[PDB]
Subunit: 131 residues, 6 copies
């Protein structure tokens, strides 16, 4: 998670495991009730302001391996180009929703915006994967 | 949660203890209502915090009623009731507002949001 | 709860839900044996230095609404006039022990003193409803 | 508890109920075997640097009322005067081991000395009541 | 664990035993499903930025003795020279993946770089011991 | 435990009982498998930078008094004098490995070094108590 510390600089702290496992146990799977976990992951995408890595923990914990692969397939299928329009160009798809840890520096506008896009794209991945 | 002015998300232990230690809102709306009401003051929740409070302690049916009721308690600046759609949406949005908790305008928007949500919890346990 | 920080300014933090239910689960109900939960609350009224709102949660969690109602009544019964006598003067009973949230400012002399009196009064109320 | 804050001033924070209840639940009762809770209390008295209130909380949670009174009586019996001898002068007994909340001030030397003394006596108390 | 502190220097805090035991209990062992613990350790290695000692705790808790020595062997079989190629030169292997506490200072490029490298080699180890 | 706060100076916080009871319940006793608990204690010794008191709590919680006795003798049995050699001169043994709470200020240099030393002897003690 990211938040402001008592100096107005963003500050990282990892998820506590308690929260992640609570979230798991107190909800049905993704397949039995996909909009339950989606509602939750979605709220958390804002409240906890998670990084790329934070998202991998969220996803890895709350989803089965192939629940997760669908989610990413779909997040990636939803990428848009500069032009506002869909793109499936491999390099733009990877730049918006990379599968391997990117180098987004969360203290710059570029990294923060990349993160904003990432979560939006993840969310759309969960929504599409569900329906 | 907010406190003096700093943000921190709810602990999930706290949201599930609250669920586990009370009955459903339908069995006993005055229970969860007194809890939420209090948490509205003590944890100074943001719109998203409110979403997790409601989403965790209410079934979808109940949340939707509560929300419907909060929205039909909305009032203009003269104190009189209103359902002009942009008046409602400004006071109790269903989608994420851009309220800034460091200012007057956002702080006020949040105090109003909590009041209405409570209005909505009261009127939906009847 | 209230306390001075790592650099000293009297600050606020909510009760942790764990503390409120641990207190509930390790003692008998108020009725069963009132001395336990009175002895407990007494302590917490000092170590945690609760706000008015903190006290509501405290009583809401540990007491049945019936019991709470008794206690609020006795806390009111115990309010004294400048003359040191019982006073049921409706406004007198409410300056000292408001049933509805007062805007006592904890960062100032009158608030902190209202707080003090509230807790004494509350403790008075707990014992009395035990007697 | 008390500890050395960043500003170099001692800083108060309440016990966590999970600490106290864990202490109770992982040890036999004082009457059933007094070394165990004595050794625990003795340690906690230094690591957590408890105020007078905190000790009330400790002793309250971990001992029955009738074990507490035995321990508090023994602690008083262990009071000593400026001449190194027992003293049962009540003003002397009550200055070293009060039964009613004192206003020792942990930010000052003499408050700090009183707290050191109180803690030593409380131990003496627990030790002799066990023997 | 380490993270960027309010002062702009890194800052250390040890693992909560809850995170480690929760990580143990909500997964298959390394042998049952080596890829599931690997994905977890890999993530934690980024999110928690563990020191050398941290990893010793991570590994000790999450793996048997057998599994740990296999991972430690492979981690050491993946060390590279200053030319980018494999090396079995003891001084180079030890320097990159020591079996005993180094003194890497994370307040310097030299120490941070050794932490990055050590983590990378540990991951390579898990992945290779796992296959 | 001791660590630097994000303000940057060496601050104290007590062990939480959860870690202590979790360390106890997820390992065997010292007598059944002294390696596991020694490995844990050794680790915690560096990660938690325990004060002298922290150590007593640590040892007391995880070891029987009998075990703790053994460990403390062996630790004392391993003190070294200022030349770098085994000393059993009682003033030197009590300076390095005090059986009674010593007057060590973790915000001072000599305080910190006394701890570093104390912890190393403590480990020698667990190890050596271990073997037997």
């Amino acid at each position: 998670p990211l938040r402001l510390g008592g100096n107005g600089q963003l500050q990282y702290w990892p998820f506590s495991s308690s929260d992640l496992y609570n979230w798991k146990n107190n909800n049905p799977s993704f397949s039995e009730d996909p909009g339950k976990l989606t509602a939750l992951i979605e709220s958390v995408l804002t409240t906890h302001q998670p990084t790329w890595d934070d998202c991998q923990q969220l996803l890895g914990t709350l989803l089965t391996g192939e629940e997760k692969q669908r989610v990413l397939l779909e997040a990636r299928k939803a990428v848009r180009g500069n032009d506002g329009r869909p793109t499936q160009l491999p390099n733009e798809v990877d730049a918006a929703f990379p599968l391997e840890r990117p180098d987004w520096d969360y203290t710059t506008t570029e990294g923060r915006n990349h993160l904003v896009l990432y979560r939006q794209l993840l969310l759309a991945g969960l929504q599409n994967a569900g329906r």
